[PDB]
Every structure is written in structure tokens, then in C-alpha cells.
């Protein structure tokens, strides 16, 4: 029960989903042909939450892959771990938005939204009990942002009761892969604060930093970053698919991490992170993982938490451990970081422990921080957009695709309102 | 002839019940298959065969824990009739577990309760096991206790509530759940037992020398407490005691019925020797505040009432001598208007060690139930937290959208203040 | 010495009879070849050899089902004399099965009935099994029952009618068939047993944990009901009961003779243990509305009469105690003018489990036959449907071209309204 439907938009979303479903299949011991050959009944007891068992004991991922270009879908169908997908799921157009949010939300999206919603409704009726949706996309490409916003709007208009998760790759401050990404980022963020339950902002800057420094890799490819994000997601949901001395679900996290409906943006963090040689030079201690999770260099969002305060903190542990040890860690870390938390929330740590570890390691930990520093990030983006809107550069594309300047005005206004709210609540005593 | 039924809400309740029924089976020599290669009549019913089943009820909204119980060792023992499961857990949201989701199966639970009651003749009371942090705990406890108190006018009702620790928390909205569920249970609970995880952690680490204890050990301890409480009914003693005796001896006023539990002896297996375990010795161990299972030093308050249940080979003369000596002490101070604050019960059956456990078998054991005024202080702390988390109106929107009013929060806070005021006011001495 | 014959109309009747005779053979230890490697004298006649044959009559217009019976396992058992077949089924058209096609073989069926009657000496009654939706069912039931009631003045006549479910339908013109056949059978049926497929579906799914039940299981249940009904005749008991006793105890007025059946216990094989199956327990199981085989909650009406047949090792003292306790309840309310609404029958023969079945063998079982006023409501629903499908005069042309008048529909509706009015009016209390 409590099945979760996976949706992927944007090229980055598709690559992340490819690696993520690879990880999931490996965890449940599912071959690329889709047959289970594992040895632990635990995997099969909750396999339904992510898979569907077709006859002859075949298993298919309950996933949807969406784009507007055939290249990425063709690549996915080409490589291994692509056969198990239902071949009818690959919805794709022919043009590709081309970093034009208006195209990805007005013209092209209006063509494939019908098929997307049809497949979504089919999947919804196919499952027993719907828990929520998790979305994968970008915020720079027009495809990702535009079509993701459109689908989120339609779905929320169709399911006001379900919980919605989004893993949006926020563009990095320093490095920008595009030229016009501030516009679409602003519009997509507007729609997200409109109709989303939680957003896991992630930057390629922070991921590159972690891969280069912590993992000691001079050549980080997209595969490595996608693998990291996949591990993060699997750790997020594993409290559902496995027993634990203190389990959590998406609803519990939503209640714990969202004090007020607007402030629902998080940052993730994973531990441990060890190189190929630097692994047997350390004891795997709950204190070690706890201290690893809390530091500037290990945050997947390019924003120093020291510049702000933590509104809420959640932690999910995997592998056997004693509760008392974790409790001691939490109390010690809250004692030493007394200046790093909001005052009006006592005991702002939400703990959860599973009982199955991440493949070959002995234990692991995932940290989800809802802090206030992230507003700084937004600030910068607005400034970028601000400059790029003062001269109205590149405006004519969106203008001739139906959008108007009032749209950008309202989007910037809403973003500034959100930043003001975040700053004000940081200053709350 | 004297039957008492169990209810388990939330994961904490289910695990506690696992430990409890494990212990009871070990006591009456009951196989996991209801066979025993009268005594058991209180808790176990007997089928046509030599198989017995426990008068237990398990309820939860997350089916994972119940599935674990079904796949656990104690599979064949339970009756799959009672293992009630839901679909989505209350998720630390009292509103979900008290207005939205609990309605889905409240009728089913009530039906099972009534069917079990009709097949019993000496129905004594209800043992409700539930935490406070979990929304399942608070919401379903409130709902079910209200329903049962509505149904049965005057029958014993006992709760084993996992009071949230002062500092070591797991959830974030624990103050809300705790305040709401306490405001609810204040009117229905005949007698509720506060237990905190932090105190048991301390006890296990310091006294049993277990540096990294798991939830299993805490469940073992609480199961021991429950077994010692009911041993008077389940067996014969030189001086037995019933639950109605407890409620008559520990409730000076209708509202003040929140005692705490303590157990002794608790020594590591390697420390089984090196002490003779005197009845006076175990008495001192019980009354030592380092062994009380709630984070409150009784030296800041007065014991309004105390009850001691001894089991094993004990003799009332030395027991009375030890108690009299205890009375002669100063820091152990009661109310002036109460001349004697001790109830004594004795059972001939010594406790039995849990196989694969951590404790060591003894010949004498003692459980203490104390209703004091120090515990009052604990409530204040929670209110403190609540106030802060209510000053900014944080997290309120979830409950609001689930069908709850802020006036409910205000009135619950007012009722908590009223209870604390009553506790403090009774704590004072009498005029002349 | 006491013989009772069976008739099966339509596919439902034939399959029900398959199950029934299967069960009877299992009871009296009868091979499919009439051998038994007195008791059986009621239902089985004996040839010159040690072979026995069942006093059964099968009639249908579609030869497929009868061919299946002939090719089934119970081939050698039946006498090919009675397996009457037609050419074209009535096809859910009461007119075809009551004016056009049924005339073709009504004489043959009557002849077989008379020949069977002449070889019997203790003729008790007729067990007619037939659905209502199928035109074969309604039409041939009306025709044959009219003929038999014309022939034999006063002899027992029992029907097991498959009342159409409130929502779960299979045909489209079910209201027409049901209304016509009920208007007909109201005057001829001594006592008819309403049974619905939806209720049995619910019972099998919830209580026997069978998520996907087939028609076979429903047939098993109904066969169990029939066997428990006749066990008093077919065997000895501390307090036996005959069909005339039933009709005298359950028919306060000549028109109101539409009871419903309920059976207990019904538990999965894996749930054979975990309960002792008390006589009070099975009594409660019977009286629980979730087990009644017709979609009507008796709490909306009053039980005008109730009869309980127990089989197995039972004792009248505890039975009487349980019944007295049942009377003390409130929601179970009868008419004021009836002081006692219970008839009791006891048989020493416990039921026997069907090999390859789904139930578990028990030592005591109880069938309940209840004549209440709640069932009246059911009729209204059908009338409702009929009215709509008659307001537009839909589908009428088939019946019109088959030799039927709209005035027949009008008069049948009027008679149904009259019966419902009588039911409601009797449901009221008495003056002073
Ligand atoms: N973290 C991560 N981000 C990626 C990866 N590959 C691409 N991206 C980001 O995703 C964006 C890709 O653009 P999309 O959102 O897919 O837009 P599109 O599908 O190409 O369609 P158009 O917008 O019309 O070009 C780029 O801006 C990158 O910043 C990856 O492997 N890992
Ligand atoms: N004594 C004891 N307490 C426990 C144990 N495990 C969990 N707890 C406490 O019980 C609470 C568990 O939450 P539940 O009451 O079960 O809530 P739930 O069933 O998950 O339903 P939701 O509230 O919607 O999440 C935690 O806050 C713990 O403090 C245990 O093993 N022993
Ligand atoms: N209890 C029970 N009822 C059944 C079963 N099979 C069919 N029925 C009911 O019986 C009806 C079958 O139609 P019949 O009465 O046999 O009609 P027929 O013999 O096909 O002749 P026509 O009416 O002309 O089609 C259906 O409407 C079902 O509701 C069964 O296995 N068990
Ligand atoms: Mg593209
Ligand atoms: Mg829960
Ligand atoms: Mg037919």
C-alpha cells in the first residue's frame, strides 16, 4: 500500500531517474529483465510501493519519463536497465522547449499534457492506496521548469489531498550553464510556492565541491552526481519500504518540517562519504556520522547555514544502532549549536531509524535541513533577474510566446515576498 | 473469574505488548502455540484444544508493525481477529488520529472490545499502552478511551503512557500531542502510569552497565513492571491486592491520579553475587530517586501516597520494620494531613528471568507505585514548550485543516494550568 | 416413511442441487454409484441392488447445464429419467417460460412428479430451487408451482429463491421477472426462503477470507443451510422438528411467509482454533446482522418469529440460557403482541465438512430462520426499479408479443404494494 508514483521531467530529471531506478532495482535485487532473484522477503513485502508485478512474476517500475526530445528517451531505451520500463510510458514530443519557459508551459506542454495526465490517472487507478508523488526535473531548461510547473498545477488541481515532492536542481550561483535561466527559474519557483508541498533544492556547485574535495575525485562526471542524488532519495523513502525501531513516512516529515505553509524548502545531506582509500581509516560511529552531516562543506545547497538559523532538522538513519546513542548525539549537537536554531521551537530535531543499511556499508545517515539561509540564494537570483529585466534582454521570445511583462513583475514580487517572510521569521524570537 | 484486557496504540504500544505477552507466556509456561507442557484464566482464554489465546487487542494505522508481529516468533499465539490495521498513520498529528482517520476503524475496535467483554465474566479493567508523541497514540487513545468510558460506566481503566522526555525528544510537535491527549485523558483515566524513555536509558546504562541499550530493554523493564502489578491477581499471596484497592489507596482526590512506577532489584548478571539483596536493601533501592522512572526528583515534592508490591519469599515483619525505618527519615516527607502513606501487597511467586535477556534472576522483587507532587513540575515544562510553539502559531495549520480549533488549544492549556494549580495547592499543608 | 422431493429450475437451481446432493451423499456415506460402503430412506430410494438413487428432478430449457451434470462426476448417481431438457432457454423472458415454452414440457415434468409421488408413501414436501432473474426461473417456477398446488391440496412446499441483489445485478429485466414471479408465488408458496448473492459474497470475503469467491462456494453455503434444515427429519435429536412445525411456528398470517436464513459457524480453516465456539458464541454470530443472508439490517424492523436448529452435541439448558439473554437485549425487538418468538430444535448429528471445500469441521452448528419485517423494505426497492423501467414502457414489447398484457404488470405491481402494506401494518404495535 501507500504506493508512490514517480514522475521525471527535463533531461536532468531523466538521467537522475535512470540512475535512481538502477539503485532501487539493485536494492531490491531486481534484474534488468524485471524478475526478482533476491533472498530477503523484506524486499518483496513492500516491493509494491514502487513496483507493479505483472504476470509470470515480472516487475515493472511505477515511473513516468517525460521530455519533448527523442534523444534522451532513445538513450534510455538503448542502455541496460531500460527494458524493465513499460514501453508505453515514454512520453516525448519532437521539438524540445529550448530554455523557453513559455514554450514548455504554453505551447508544447499543452500538446502532451493530455497523454501525461491520462497515464497518470491510469497509474493512480492501478494502485491500491496513493501516498504521494515525487518529481524530478531541473529549473534551468525550459522543458523541465515549464512542463513540471504545468503538470504540478494540473495534478494538484486533481488531487488536493496527496503529498507532492520535488527535487529541483536549482542553478548554481557562480556557474551558469545557460544565459536566460533566471527568468524560467523565477517563474517555476513562483509556481512551486503556489502548488508544492516540499522542494529539495540542489545545486551542481555544491555537488561538484563535495565530489572533488570529500570524495577526492578530479574528474566528477554527471553519473556521480546523479548517483549521489539517487542515494539521497532512496535514503529518504527507505523508512517506508523497510521496518525500523522508529519509522517515518512522507506525511510525518511534511508535518514536522513545515511550521508554516509557505516555508517548505529543504536541503539534503548524506553520510558517510569516504574515498576508496580513506574508508578503513575511520570508525563508523553515530557521533561520526552526526558530525559529518553538520558542516558547511557537506551541504548540497550553496548556502552557509551559519549565515542563518535552522528552522527544523530531520534525520533518517540506516543500519543497526542504539537509540540512546543517537539521542546523546542530538542533545550534544543542539547544546553546542545553541545559536544556530530558532528560539521559539524547543527540540527541533526529528529522528527516524530504519533497520537496513545501504548496500555494502554498515550504517548511513541522511539529514534534511529546513533553514533560513537559503533565502540568500534566492536574493542573488532575483538580482540576476533584476538586471536582466532592467534591459528586458531576451524578453521578445517570451513576449511572442504569449507571456507578458506583468508575469515577470508578479513573479519577482512573489519571490521578494517569500524572501521577506523567510528573513522575518529568522528574526523571530 | 477475574479478567483484564489489553489495548495497544501506536508502535510503542505494540512493542510494549510484545514484551508483555512474551513475559506472561514465560510465566505461565505457555508455548508460542498456546500449549502448556486456575492461574492463566485471568489473561488467557482456552479453546477446545489445549491451545490458549491472549485476550489482547492490537490497533495501529501503519500496517508495518502489525506485519512484523505476524511474521515474528509469536505468530501462532495471537488470534488474527484482533490485529487491526489501517492504511496511513496519523503521522504525529492528533487531529488525524482523533477526527479524520480514527473514525475509520473506531467502530471495528469497539466491536472487538465488546465481543471480548461478552465472553468474559470477571472483567476487571483495561490496560492501554500508548506513547504520547505519536499522533496515533494521542488521537486513538483519546477516541477509544472516550468511547469505552461512555460504554462502561465504572470499570477499572489503566494507561501506561510514555511521557515525552524533558530534553531527549524524537518528534517536533510532541508538546501539542501531549497537551491535547492529557487534557482528554484527565477526565476518563482512572489511573495512568507515567514512564519516560530518558529515565529508563539512565537506569539501564548506569545500573545494568549496558552502554548502548535498545528499545527492547526498555520494553523488558515495562513488561516486568506490569507483571509485578498484576501478580497479585494472577497468583496467591500472604496479602494480595486488587486494582480497586490501588485506586482506593492512591487517589485522595478525583483528579490527582498520575503516579509513577519504580522497580527493583536491577543488577547485571555479573553482579548477581556481591550483595545479599535484603528486603530493606531493595526498599532503599526503590526509594532512591536515581531509580525512579520519571525525570523528577521526589525531594522537590511530597509523596502523597505510596504502594509497594513484593513478590517472592518475603516476610511481613521485616517488611514492616523496613517501612517504619523509611518513615523515620526526613527528606521522605508526606502531607501533614496524611498520617500513613503506605500500602503493602505480598505475592508468593518470584519473578522469572526473560531468556535471552539482560537481568539476573532474583528470589524477591518489589514494584513501587508513587503518587507524589514532584511530578507536577514535569507538566509545567511541557506547557513551557507548548507556549513557545504556540506563541508563533507554528504548525497550527495542519491541525486547522484537519478539523480542529485554536480554542481547543487554548482550553487545553487552561485545563493543564488548572491541574497544575490543583497539584500545587494540594501540595501545601493544612491549617491547624 | 418421510420423503421429500426436489425440483431445480434454471442454471442456479441445477448448480444448487449439485451442491446439495453432493452434501447429502457425503452425509449418508453414499458413493457416486449409489453404494454405501433408516437414515437415507427420506431422500434416497433403493433399487434391487445396493445401489440408491436420489428422488430428484432437474428441469431446464438450455441443455448445456444438464449435459454438464451428465458429464460431471455425479453421472452414475442420477437416474437419466428425470434429467429433462428443452431446446431454447426462456432467455430472461417470463412470458417465454410461462406461456410459450414451458407448455412444451410442463406435462412431462408433472408426469415425472406424479410417478415419483406414487412410489413414495411418506411424501412430506417439495424443495424448489430457482433464481429470479432468469426467465426460466420465474416462468417455470410459476407454471410448475401452480400445477402442483392445483394437484395436491395441502402439502408442504418450500422454495429457495435467489432474490436479486439491490445493486449487483447481472441481467437487465430482473425487476420484471421478480415482480411477476413473486405475484404468482405469493398465493402458492407455503414458505419461501430469500437468499441473495451479494450477502453471500460479503460473508465469504469478510468471514472466510476468500477474496475471490466463485459460485461453487455460495452453493456450498446454501447446501449447508438445506442440510441443516432437514437434519431433524433425516436423524434423531433430543428435540426434533418437522416442516409442519416450522410452518405453524413461523406464519402468523397466511400471506407473511417470507423468512430469511442464516448459518453459523463460518470460520476459515486457519482460524479453526483461536476460539472455543460457544453455544452462546454461535448464537451471537447468528444474530449478528453482518451474517444475515439478505441485504436487510433487522435493526430497521422487528423479528416476528425466529427458529433455531442446532446440530451436534448441544445441551438445552445452556441453549435456553443464551436465548433468554438474547431476549433481554433491546435492539432485538419483536412485536408487542407476541410474547415469545423462538422455536428450538436439536439434532445429534454434527455437520460434516465438504472435502475439497473451504470451511472447517465443527462439532456444533446452528441454522436460523427468521421471519421479520425488515425484509419488507427490500420489496420496495424492486418496485422502485420496476416503476422506472415501467414508466417508459421499456422492454414491454417482447412480453407483449409473447402473449402477455400490460394489465398483468399493473396488477402485479398492485399486489406487491398490497403485500408491502400488509407487512408494514403488521409491523405496527397493538392498541392497549
Ligand atoms: N545535477 C545534474 N544536473 C544536470 C545534469 N544534466 C543536465 N543538468 C541540468 O539540467 C538542465 C538541462 O536542461 P533541461 O531542463 O533538461 O531542458 P531540456 O530538456 O534540454 O529542454 P530545453 O529547455 O528546451 O533545452 C541543464 O541546465 C543542467 O543544468 C546532470 O546530469 N546532473
Ligand atoms: N518505551 C518505548 N517507547 C517507544 C518505543 N518506540 C517508540 N517509542 C515512542 O513512541 C513513539 C512512536 O510513535 P507512535 O505513537 O507509534 O506514532 P505512530 O504509530 O508512528 O503514528 P503517527 O503519530 O502518525 O506517526 C515515539 O515518539 C517514541 O517516543 C519503544 O520501543 N519503547
Ligand atoms: N446462488 C447462485 N445463483 C446463481 C448461480 N448462477 C447463476 N445464478 C443466478 O441465476 C440466474 C441464472 O439465470 P437462470 O434462472 O438460470 O435463467 P436461464 O436458465 O439462463 O434461462 P433464461 O432466463 O431464458 O436465460 C442469474 O441471474 C444469477 O443471478 C450460482 O451459481 N449460485
Ligand atoms: Mg531540451
Ligand atoms: Mg505512525
Ligand atoms: Mg436460460
Numbering used by the authors:
A (entry chain H): 1 to 429
B (entry chain A), C (entry chain E): 1 to 37, 47 to 441
From the article:
During incorporation into the MT lattice, GTP hydrolysis is triggered by the catalytic glutamate in α-tubulin (E254), which becomes juxtaposed to the GTP in β-tubulin at the longitudinal interface between dimers. GTP hydrolysis has a destabilizing effect on the MT structure, and polymerization can only continue in the presence of a GTP-tubulin cap at the growing end of the MT. Here, in order to better understand the GTP conformation of MTs, we used cryo-EM to visualize MTs assembled from recombinant wild-type (wt) and mutant human tubulin in which the catalytic glutamate in α-tubulin was mutated to alanine or asparagine (E254A or E254N, respectively), making them deficient in GTP hydrolysis.
Next, we used cryo-EM to determine the lattice parameters of E254N MTs (3.8-Å resolution from 13,706 particles). The lattice parameters of E254N MTs are similar to GMPCPP-MTs, in which the lattice has a rise of 83.95 Å and a twist of +0.23°. Comparison of backbone deviations for the tubulin dimer between the E254N MTs and either GMPCPP-MTs or GDP-MTs clearly shows the E254N and GMPCPP similarity. Here, we found that E254N and E254A MTs also do not show any pf opening at the seam either in the absence or presence of EB3 (refer also to Movie S4 for a morph between E254N MTs and wt MTs showing the rotation of pfs proximal to the seam).
